[PDB]
Amino acid sequence: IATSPYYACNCPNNCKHKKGSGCKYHSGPSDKSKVISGKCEWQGGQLNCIAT
């Protein structure tokens, strides 16, 4: 599963994804975590994946 929402959408770490681009990320301990769908959105300068 994709890493944190911040890094997945972040440009310096992932410029592939831009605002409006779909994205996913796991939010839980160990493998027990589950991939959460979402969309990349700017938080005033940084790209973060916002799970809908």
From Swiss-Prot:
Applied value in biotechnology: NFAP2 provides a feasible base for the development of a fundamental new, safely applicable mono- or polytherapeutic topical agent for the treatment of superficial candidiasis. Moreover, thanks to the slow emergence of NFAP2-resistant Candida strains, NFAP2 can reliably be used long-term in the clinic. The combination of NFAP2 and rationally designed antifungal peptide derivatives (PDs) as biofungicide can also be used for the fungal infection control in plants and crops as well as in postharvest fruit protection.
Region named Lipid-binding: 10-20
Localization of this protein: Secreted
Broad class of the protein's primary localization: secreted
Presence of keyword Metal-binding: no
Paired cysteines (S-S): 9-23, 11-40, 15-49
Motif, Gamma-core: chain positions: 38-49
Keyword Disulfide bond appears in the UniProt entry: yes
Domain of life of the source: Eukaryota
Keywords from the named record: Antimicrobial, Disulfide bond, Secreted, Signal
Task of the protein: Cysteine-rich antifungal protein highly effective against yeasts such as clinically relevant Candida species, including the multidrug-resistant pathogen Candida auris. Does not cause metabolic inactivity and apoptosis induction, but the fungal cell-killing activity is connected to its pore-forming ability in the cell membrane. NFAP2 has a low potential to trigger resistance in C.albicans in vitro, and the developed tolerance to NFAP2 is not associated with severe phenotypic changes compared with development of resistance to generic fluconazole.
Domain remarks: The lipid-binding region (residues 44 to 54) shows potency to insert into the lipid bilayer, where the disulfide bond-stabilized short motif CPNNC could play a key role. In addition, several areas, including the beginning of the N-terminal (residues 1-8), play roles in facilitating initial membrane contacts.
Official protein name in the record: Antifungal protein 2
Organism: Neosartorya fischeri (strain ATCC 1020 / DSM 3700 / CBS 544.65 / FGSC A1164 / JCM 1740 / NRRL 181 / WB 181)
Gene it is expressed from: nfap2
